[PDB]
Amino acid sequence: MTPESVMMMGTEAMKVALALAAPLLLVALITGLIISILQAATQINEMTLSFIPKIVAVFIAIIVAGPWMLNLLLDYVRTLFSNLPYIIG
């Protein structure tokens, strides 16, 4: 009820969002950086060949860590809906 509780609500929610999005974004960033440094080493420059492995890497990311995200988000929503009638004002 108190504004401290509200702002905590937003923080924990958006940290959950950060945890959900961090693996995919970080995998894409690492793949892009690796392809870019390889291009710099080989002196190859086409703006389209960096887009190819990124999709494959990010799609594999759901294969490997997808169940973890799905279990984390469901637990968050379940706990939020269960604690809903105790943060009422």
Binding site: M1, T2, P3, V6, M7, M9, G10, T11, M14, K15, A17, L18, A21, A22, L25, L26, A28, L29, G32, L33, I35, S36, Q39, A40, N45, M47, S50, F51, K54, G89
Partner: protein, 253 residues
């Protein structure tokens, strides 16, 4: 006996109802479409039932241009109060949308302005957070109390009016921008530095950077930055509400 003078009761219960309902239809949270219309009408009716008997009853007939002037006055007062209150949420929405646009979340606006493709999701997040904070600080009760109080300052009866006062509400349009800049400032600046950092990377081997490495990094950095910046809005939320409230108190009179 068995009089029950109806015109007296109607004139006593009408104009306060007009002002209360005019505030209701525009005041934030009390004007959200999710409330059924009958609930809003009943709240206005009950508030008027509580308030009106204490006020001096007016005797101007409903079939006169004076009644039209009175109705216009009540509508103006109600919409002015509600809109001045709404300005703070407008400012919060502006700050959130700008943080989100510096995230690169909606890049299609820079190339196709107003092209039916825009999602200010951060703006919505902080808008609903601001609504929750406003609910916590009981701002709506204050709004109702000030709606009641503006009578003593400005009675139902037609009273003369001023000018630059309207400018004040219009000049409040500056606040939406001015306060929005500060909220952002605590994050956009660092994001700016990040973009500057990306520039240093592009000053190296040409191409092979930006649109491939900049976007995910800046998205994650914006996310964690403003996630850490979330505790900061609440003092600024109270500052915004106080600014709107004392501006209203000073200018309505």
């Amino acid at each position: 006996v068995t009089s029950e003078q109806w015109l007296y009761w109607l004139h006593l219960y009408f104009w306060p109802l007009l002002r209360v309902l005019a505030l209701i239809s525009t005041a934030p949270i009390l004007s959200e479409r999710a409330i059924p219309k009958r609930v809003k009408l009943g709240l206005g009716i009950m508030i008027t039932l509580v308030i009106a008997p204490s006020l001096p009853a007016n005797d101007t007939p409903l079939f006169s241009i004076a009644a039209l002037w009175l109705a216009m006055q009540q509508i103006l007062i109600g919409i002015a109060l509600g809109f001045t209150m709404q300005f703070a949420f407008a400012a919060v929405r502006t700050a959130g949308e700008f943080i989100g646009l510096q995230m690169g979340l909606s890049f299609a606006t820079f190339v196709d302005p107003g092209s039916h493709l825009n999602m200010p999701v951060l703006a919505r997040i902080m808008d609903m957070l601001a609504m929750l904070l406003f609910l916590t600080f009981n701002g709506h009760l204050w709004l109702i109390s000030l709606l009641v109080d503006t009578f003593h300052t400005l009675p139902i009866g037609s009273n003369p009016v001023n000018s630059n006062a309207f400018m004040a509400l219009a000049r409040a349009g500056g606040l939406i921008f001015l306060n929005g800049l500060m909220l952002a400032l605590p994050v956009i600046t660092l994001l700016l530095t990040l973009n500057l950092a990306l520039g240093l990377l592009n000053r190296m081997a040409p191409q092979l950077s930006i649109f491939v490495i900049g976007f995910p990094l800046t998205l994650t950095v914006g996310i964690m930055l403003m996630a850490a910046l979330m505790p900061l809005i609440a003092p600024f939320c109270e500052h915004l509400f106080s600014e709107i409230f004392n501006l209203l108190a000073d200018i309505v009179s």
